[PDB]
């Protein structure tokens, strides 16, 4: 199925957890883990992945 | 040349030849470790059921070979303790007591040392001294080696042997006083060693109660007198004079025996008393 990822891009996420890493980078890592896990499903081939950012279009 | 326990299991004089070698490879303590490990290996039944190793003829041969090596070493508690683990020492001492024909389970204090044969007497004395020294070393704070990343295979054995060591330590603590009573009677070179062990045990115990310090002081003074009497001819007594001197200073801080000149005149102890 269609997979879309709307990632917040405002400065707010630039905070850092006790891991010393930003919320944005944690989000990217979580997305990567998600795609890794989904790859285990044979139906993965039918998946199309999308990214969207909070910035004003066309970007 | 490397010779494992199988050679000595098959042939007995091989042990004699190895101990006669000026450089026995492996070292005798390593031989003890290997033999007792083989003896203590648990028995797995066909149903994958773990059970204590049956005491077969091979097991008895291993045990008596280890005991022969220990006798050749002359039962140097320093060497055995430093080079061998607490469970190993405990089981080896128990086996030595058993081969001494001592009825297992009988409390040591119940038997008169003089009545027993000299070998059994020294065996019981060595067992009690080892128990006291084990308690003292357990009380000693020991630096912990830097932990590596988890190794699930080795940590199993490490934790298992640590638990067994803790159980042995608590067992020894439960009977520590009885060992003191036995050693007190046994005191009537080996006498100096026993007296020093008793003094150290008394000092450790009196860490809480100051009364035991007087007994420790008397023991340490008798130990130094024994050192003076024996002289340099100590072939089995190996005790540092500096530690007992410190013990005597600490106890004299408690008991003033007059004779200020003979006793410390340092401004330090003088300010202590002042």
């Amino acid at each position: 199925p269609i997979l879309l990822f709307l990632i917040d891009t405002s400065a707010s996420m630039n905070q850092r957890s006790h891991l010393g890493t930003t919320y944005l980078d944690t989000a990217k890592g979580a997305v990567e883990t998600f795609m890794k896990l989904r790859a285990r499903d044979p139906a993965s081939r039918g998946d199309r992945y999308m990214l969207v950012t909070f910035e004003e279009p066309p970007y | 040349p490397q010779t494992c326990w199988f050679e000595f299991l098959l042939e007995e004089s091989l042990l004699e030849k190895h101990l006669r070698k000026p450089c026995p490879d492996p070292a005798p303590v390593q031989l003890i470790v290997q033999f007792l490990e083989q003896a203590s290996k648990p028995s797995v039944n066909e149903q994958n059921q773990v059970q204590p190793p049956p005491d077969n003829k091979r097991n008895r041969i291993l045990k008596l070979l280890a005991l022969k090596v220990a006798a050749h070493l002359k039962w140097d508690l320093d060497i055995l303790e430093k080079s061998l683990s607490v469970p190993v020492l405990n089981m080896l001492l128990n086996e030595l007591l058993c081969i001494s024909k001592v009825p297992p389970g009988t409390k040591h204090v119940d038997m008169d040392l003089a009545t027993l044969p000299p070998t059994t007497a020294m065996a019981v004395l060595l067992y009690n001294r080892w128990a006291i020294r084990t308690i003292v070393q357990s009380s000693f704070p020991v630096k912990q080696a830097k932990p590596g990343p988890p190794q699930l295979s080795v940590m199993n054995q490490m934790q298992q042997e640590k638990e067994l060591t803790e159980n042995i330590l608590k067992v020894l603590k439960e009977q520590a006083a009885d060992s003191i009573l036995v050693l007190e009677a046994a005191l009537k070179e080996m006498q100096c060693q026993v007296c020093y062990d008793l003094g150290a045990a008394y000092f450790q115990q009196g860490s809480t109660n100051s009364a035991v310090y007087e007994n420790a002081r008397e023991k340490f003074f008798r130990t130094k007198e024994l050192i003076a009497e024996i002289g340099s001819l100590s072939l089995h007594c190996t005790i540092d004079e500096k530690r007992l001197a410190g013990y005597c200073q600490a106890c004299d801080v408690l008991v003033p025996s007059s004779d200020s000149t003979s006793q410390q005149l340092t401004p330090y102890s003088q300010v202590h008393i002042c």
Binding site: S10, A11, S12, N14, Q15, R16, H18, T22 | -
Partner: protein, 82 residues
Amino acid sequence: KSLQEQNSHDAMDSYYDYIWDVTILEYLTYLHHKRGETDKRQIAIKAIGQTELNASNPEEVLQLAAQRRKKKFLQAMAKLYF
């Protein structure tokens, strides 16, 4: 409405340390990036990234931090005038 105008007279950069609300700093970062002022955009990013404030603490530390920054700001502000 106040941060928007360009006629500041109050050492606009050095004061970013005292501000302790994440949202206004988000506004500041957006404004600086849009107007093309990276030397201050980085300062704003650092101020946000500071661990003291995260908008998710048990608030025991957040209130203390806000109190401390208030003290520092009002102390400097009092030093400036008179």
